[PDB]
Amino acid sequence: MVISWIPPYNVPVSFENLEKSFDGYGPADGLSHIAPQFWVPDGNGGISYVTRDDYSMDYMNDDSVKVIRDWGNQYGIKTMLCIYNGEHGWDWSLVSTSISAANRQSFVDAIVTEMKRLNLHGVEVDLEGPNADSPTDTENFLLFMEKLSDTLSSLGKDLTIATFASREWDHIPDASHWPELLPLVDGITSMGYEETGINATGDLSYAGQKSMAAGAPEKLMLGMPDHLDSWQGSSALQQVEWAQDNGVGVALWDMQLRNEAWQRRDIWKALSEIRGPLGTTYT
Questions:
Q1: Measured on CA atoms in the order 103, 106, 108, 114, is the torsion positive or negative?
Q2: In the chain, is it the N or the C terminus that has fewer CB atoms within a 10 Å radius of its CB?
Q3: Cβ-count burial of 201 within 10 angstroms (0-12 exposed, 13-18 middle, 19+ buried)?
Q4: What ranges do the domains of the chain cover?
Q5: Where is the GH18 domain (predicted)?
Q6: What is the largest CA-CA distance in the chain?
Q7: Domain 2-275 belongs to what topology?
Q8: Residue 250 and residue 230: Cα distance in Å, rounded?
Q9: Is-contact 122 80, C-beta < 8 A?
Q10: Helix, strand, coil proportions of the chain in percent (round to 5)?
C-alpha cells in the first residue's frame, strides 16, 4: 500500500498537489490511499471535525472531504476517514476515555457512521500516546481495533493505523503492538520518518522495521517525510527504492510535498511501481 495524508492546515497546498504530474508521474499514480486528517475524538465516544482556528477551517467540511474522495475515485484511490488525537499535540486522554468499556462501542459506531456518511473507503487510525502505554491501555486499544476491524471487514472497507516506529519505549501504539495489530488491519504506517532508513540501526533500520512486521510485512508502510531530500545517509529516492526492492509500502507525510525531492518524476514513478494498478481511470 502507499498512503499519504492531507493535514488540516495548508489544505490549499495539498489540494493543488493532488493533481500534479511531475514529468508524467505524481500522486494519482503513486498513492493507493489518501487520508485527510480532519477528525478528532471528543473523548466521550464521539468524533468531530478539527476546530483549531489556525488550521484550514474553510476546508473542515463535508464538501472539501468529497473533493478528495471524488479526486481519488477517478483513479481507484481510497479516501480514508482519518481520526487523530494530535490537534493540540498528542493527547492520549481523549483516546483512553474513547476506548474504555463504557464508550468503545459508541466510538466505533461514530467513526463508522462518519465514514459511511461521506462514502469513504476505510478508516486511518492515528491515535497516538507517547509514553502512555499500560496493560489497561494496550488491552482496550486492541479491543477497540478488533471491533473496528470486524465492523469494517463486514462492510468491505479498509483499516489502516499509524504507530510509533520503535518498540523499546512505553509508547502506544508502537512496534511492540504490530504482531497483534497486523491480523486486524490492511496497513501499518510506522512513523519513523527521519529516524528510520536503510542505514539506521537495529529496530530503526528498514530491515529491522520489516523484521518487526514479520507475519505480514507487505502490510508495513515506512513513514517518509516530504520536507527532506535525504535522511540516514540515503536520498529520498533510495529510501523508496528500498521499499520497492524489499516488498513493503510507503507512507508519505505529507501532501504538502515541500522538498523538491518529492516533486520529481523518478520517485513518483517508483511509488507507482510499488503501488501497482488500481482499476480503470475515469477522470
A1: negative
A2: C
A3: exposed
A4: 2-275
A5: 9-278
A6: 53
A7: TIM Barrel (3.20.20)
A8: 15
A9: yes
A10: 40, 20, 35
